[PDB]
Design an enzyme around this catalytic site. Sequence first.
Site: not given
Lengths: 244, 245, 245, 244, 244, 244
Positions: B114-117, B109
């Site tokens: 990066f669209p990380k969860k 992120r």
Amino acid sequence: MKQQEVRQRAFAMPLTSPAFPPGPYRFVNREYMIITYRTDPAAIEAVLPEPLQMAEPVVRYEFIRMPDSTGFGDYSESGQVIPVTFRGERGSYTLAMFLDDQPPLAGGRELWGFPKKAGKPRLEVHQDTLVGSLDFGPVRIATGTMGYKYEALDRSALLASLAEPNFLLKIIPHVDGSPRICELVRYHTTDVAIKGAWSAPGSLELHPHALAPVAALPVLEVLSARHFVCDLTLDLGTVVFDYL
Amino acid sequence: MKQQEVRQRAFAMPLTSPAFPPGPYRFVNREYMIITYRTDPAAIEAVLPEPLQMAEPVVRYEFIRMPDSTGFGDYSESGQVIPVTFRGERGSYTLAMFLDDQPPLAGGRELWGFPKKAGKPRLEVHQDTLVGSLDFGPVRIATGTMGYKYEALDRSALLASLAEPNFLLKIIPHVDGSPRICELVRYHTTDVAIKGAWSAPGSLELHPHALAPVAALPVLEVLSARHFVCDLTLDLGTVVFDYLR
Amino acid sequence: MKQQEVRQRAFAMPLTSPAFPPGPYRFVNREYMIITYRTDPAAIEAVLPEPLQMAEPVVRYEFIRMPDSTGFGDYSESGQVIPVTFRGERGSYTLAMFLDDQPPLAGGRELWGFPKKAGKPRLEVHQDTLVGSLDFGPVRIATGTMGYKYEALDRSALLASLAEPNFLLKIIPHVDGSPRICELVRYHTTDVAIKGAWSAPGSLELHPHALAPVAALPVLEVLSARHFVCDLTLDLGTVVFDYLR
Amino acid sequence: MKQQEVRQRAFAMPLTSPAFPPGPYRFVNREYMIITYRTDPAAIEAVLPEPLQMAEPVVRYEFIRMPDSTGFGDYSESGQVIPVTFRGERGSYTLAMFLDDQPPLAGGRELWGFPKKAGKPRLEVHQDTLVGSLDFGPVRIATGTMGYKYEALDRSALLASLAEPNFLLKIIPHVDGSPRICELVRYHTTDVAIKGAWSAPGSLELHPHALAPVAALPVLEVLSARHFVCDLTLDLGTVVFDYL
Amino acid sequence: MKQQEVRQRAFAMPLTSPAFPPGPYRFVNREYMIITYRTDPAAIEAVLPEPLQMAEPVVRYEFIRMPDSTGFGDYSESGQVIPVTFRGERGSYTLAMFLDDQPPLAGGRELWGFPKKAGKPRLEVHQDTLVGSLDFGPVRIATGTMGYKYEALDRSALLASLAEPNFLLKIIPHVDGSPRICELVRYHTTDVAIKGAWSAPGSLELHPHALAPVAALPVLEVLSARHFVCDLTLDLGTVVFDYL
Amino acid sequence: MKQQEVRQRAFAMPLTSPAFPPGPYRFVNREYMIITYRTDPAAIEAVLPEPLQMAEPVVRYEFIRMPDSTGFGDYSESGQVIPVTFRGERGSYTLAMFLDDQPPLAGGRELWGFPKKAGKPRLEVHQDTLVGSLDFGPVRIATGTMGYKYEALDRSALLASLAEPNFLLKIIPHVDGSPRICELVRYHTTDVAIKGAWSAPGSLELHPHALAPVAALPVLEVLSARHFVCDLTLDLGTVVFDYL
């Protein structure tokens, strides 16, 4: 989804289902065990970023239960905070925090610049003892204990302490690895309502870890232990110094 | 510690013990299961940020094993990638990812955007089936299956995609909530050595979740499935559009 | 779906989703523990179908790990092989095999005519010992042990057996129960790359079972033990005698 | 063990201890949950091998307990069967079956040509509900439910249904991969004795799987659910059409 | 005990130890997750009894925790509710409800005419998500999720929603199987105190079941989600339409 | 869903998916353990509603397994039954019943007026002993034991006690809490086939419980134990005395 609506809607990644929501960030019945200890002054100096000035050579080691937190959920926190002055103003510097819930971890890092890492904090009463613990994967790195509500704590001092400025070093790399954000941030906790506050005898033991170096400020002498329960609002920060 | 040393040392928080280290980020025996499916074109347009432009109306739903990653450790990932063009160049856009390891999460992120969860991705062989799963807390939000190594894949044709650009919308709030970083980022995976690549029949089911809305791009029909293993370097990315210029 | 398409597509049941895929059947890091033992020659003659002819009165009892098999997945096998000649050519005859994965099981039987039944084979290192086990339901029918990599084996001498022919009696009933397929099949393992080969001391015990009669060839004395790992292709076999000509 | 005695003794592999015995195959108290559903007619057409003709665009999805089966033992089955006509004669076509016992799986494939694969079928009463389930390794691919014995079912229709021809596409590859057997087979279940038969409200959900594509004929509308217990004899098939 | 004492004491069965007690039924810290979705209008018209009138083609799917309920104990509920009009008044119709505690199950059916069956409802926070589930035996039939407390909800809108009439079709058979009671019942929850109320993004998935057919009102589109905590009193209902 | 359909359809709630179906209610392999004990006559008169009249001062304490029950499922029951005369005719009165399955609990209460509450009855052979147990939540309230099939029992006499009328006090509240139904119901078990009947030594222990007061009829002396297995039909009851 036009370029202008993207600018307007952007808050956190991912754009269309962001990892954490905007505030106000309201906390109900957060419960703190804080053990204050005297450490080697040389060890504080080695981690303190100027323009921040050192104060008493003490560390406040905290375990926090946050069972009801808007936008974040139900989680626990452990952390190292150090008293400092900035422009001769007295407050706090957060060296390390550890959380077990992702929304407050990303939100904390990306928005205020809390130095959050992942960990397993717990804070629980076991019969006669309030036990705070922190694991980092399979390694216990902190164990705190207190007696249970021995004496009432002075609300004045407590409320004045929760009113003090809180400073943080927000760093965010640019896509190339060089700092894009790198500032000192000041934030406050406001709308503080204490539900109860106590002291008791307390203890702390820290353990070494490569990725979670709390033990780097050693426990020479435990000075006090406070336990308290409160509602509060975690207000947005403001930049008070920009390194760039 | 003087304020010039602060500015030199600064890479990631906390300053004196960063949440993740600088690269290069090398990846060994990175294992992919990718299920490609045709979705509603309208669902893609709802989520695609201009100047990015839509290509074919397909989603590549991926499950990835990363057992050996420099600086990050040993982890897994699942997520949703779509074909895109920017200035008529073909590439990918990452819509959502989910990981079970924090350093790659913060790293992903804060650095590339990066669209990380957080999530529990798994990728495991169960006798005759390669099974990909993603759980978000107690809820199963993605289940993928493939046959096991039915057909060897044209390897030269594979590196055809592993060299093309990957686009990401990097967004970081300022302390006041308004965006401080808001840009399109182009990154590449370089140094790519393929160890094996295969196709087989495939399946996919996705389930709704308020905080992990993968199901928002609905699975209308599965088009292909591919399984492959490789070494690879995740190169640092570049800004190719800055929304806050 | 017209009856010419039915005849083209037809490989294995079910027609539109076959129980196993066509090859080639590639095998990577196939791991063997083979215990050779001298048995009663009379027990061998009771079970050997002419024109197959008996050689030395020995059984090679095998335990095999197959963690990476194209089309079949990840499985294990245990079984009983004997030295044989057909038209004075030396080879092996497979008397019994047991697997814990269905596609290789159906595949094995329907295609080559491997004499496969279901079982729980295991092959695992336990500190200093390589342990082979076979369970048939709740009953242990085979336990084998070896020392761990005592002596490196003459590799060139090993491929000496990995190139020779393997014979199988393929039998499939017609719908009425009388045999529709009844032939001797010769297959080869080709493309054999040995990664290691070793000998060590060895043991074997077998237990009776009504439906898994491995103990029928009794263990009179253990003669040798070998452990080896390899890549390998199981080539399609050939008819070399058809009992129903 | 002379060449002539091999021809004579051969039935199933291995020759001297065959994987399944010869019949008669007698079934005592097999218990069926069948959920009949209307599907997309296009999806039946796509899997139906001529000379077989389509009938009503319905699927009978079955869960069968077989606690007492001669030569095979104690096992459970799940399966997709579709109504068809062959030379204008009305019967059934079995698209997919899944079993948890090897002798009936090899026997089924090799002898009649049932399209059997491995799976974990279960059929059980949970307080008020008859629950049918099918797992393929760790993935649930079918869940059926019915009320418990709401109404008696018409034995006439049932016995006439169990009397209908059952068709199967037997395929067996030659050592070289090309079809050695490839025929339409007709078989019957005879000596049928119903012990009980009922209907109730029912439900079905199917899930996708690469190796077990039951979901490929989607559940548009559940039409009925029948539950019944019977003894029967699974008779040998006869070839009614040979593709070769 | 004389015939007259029998009538004077008669409230619920067993006479001398009733399966539930008289009220008032007070509820403390009732916690709701309600997901409202759009469904097929024809699917509502199939199940709404006249003289009740359909409003929007909308279903309010609920998960409720009742940890403190006078007379009943500590239990959980999951239910399906339809907006209706009746005599120019906007209200709700309860189609189906599932409970894990017997006294409120018998009590709800026999006193008000709640359409209650047994099930396992849960409502818990898992870190960042509020998760609602309903199991009917071994079978999951409903799963709902919400973010945790994203934004405060209009308390005036909420109280007005809790003030509207709630309609139930009460049916009780006579010994012979013909209806002895068949009537529309109107009830209210009064003495309402909101302790908190929020909205956040939400999701629902429903699965078919023969005996808990909640899936017969399909989730075409999730419209909203709300989460609140309150005290209330479930008042005794009144007959508003007697079918007999 | 019209008005006049509502009163034709209406059997049990919910209207569109009733909590239990209509009969006939058919039981196969209903297995009973009955321990007959002498009790305090004053304790019987305290609970007996006139016009019902007390006979011998005994209680028939039951444990019943019902593995196969049309419409209801597979379940168990425990209960307390007393002999009684109504209008000089000898029958039974059911004081108390406990079931582990909802459809027969709702159906029992709403249709016949059985005095049914939830509980966990079990009846199982442990080596040499038939053991019946009843738990209400975490609390054991009844434990019965018998030897195993010591002597065959005279079936023709048994079959007679199974033809006697059974009386129940059916009570259902009106929405306002006053009794809407309050009546003595007479019902029969018909079409009885005894599969075996036995006697043996027996024992019974009862424990108090606020909500399951079986112990209020104290076990003074155990008189007999009986064990039997049967098929039967539970006929719909008739009203023989309406208090209202």
